[PDB]
């Protein structure tokens, strides 16, 4: 399910950015996370958490299109 996968990214971005999950649910899927206070120090940790989830991606494969929709 795509929305449960969004909820796991919502959990990760709430944890990484220091936000409530509600503030990450306040994004549209296409909203720019570097627009919304993400950076590489966080996006590396996300890339590890994704690889730990089994969801192997390299940093650019996320960071080329920096919104939930592309991820």
- Rounded Cα distance between 46 and 62, Å, is 9
What resolution in Å is listed for this PDB structure? 3.8
C-beta of residue 19 within 8 angstroms of C-beta of residue 10: no
Q: Which CATH architecture has domain 2-71?
A: Orthogonal Bundle (1.10)
C-beta of residue 5 within 8 angstroms of C-beta of residue 50: no
Crossing angle of the two packed helices 2-17 and 40-52, in degrees rounded to 10 = 140
Percentages helix, strand, coil for the chain (3-state, rounded to 5) are: 55, 5, 40
- Name the experiment that determined this structure: cryo-EM
Three-state secondary structure call for residue 66: coil
Q: Name residues whose C-beta falls within 8 Å of residue 1's C-beta, 6 or more positions apart in sequence.
A: none
Give strand pairing partners of 67.
32
- Rounded Cα distance between 3 and 41, Å, is 26
Residue 18 CA neighbour count, 13 Å, CB half: 3
The residue with tokens 């494969």 is: 61
């Amino acid at each position: 399910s795509r929305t449960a996968l969004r909820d796991w990214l919502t959990e990760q971005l709430a944890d990484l950015l220091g936000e409530p999950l509600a503030d990450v649910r306040a994004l549209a899927d296409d909203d720019d996370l570097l627009g919304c206070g993400l950076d590489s120090i966080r996006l590396m940790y996300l890339q590890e958490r994704l690889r730990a989830r089994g969801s192997t991606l390299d940093f650019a494969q996320l960071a080329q299109r920096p919104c939930l929709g592309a991820w």
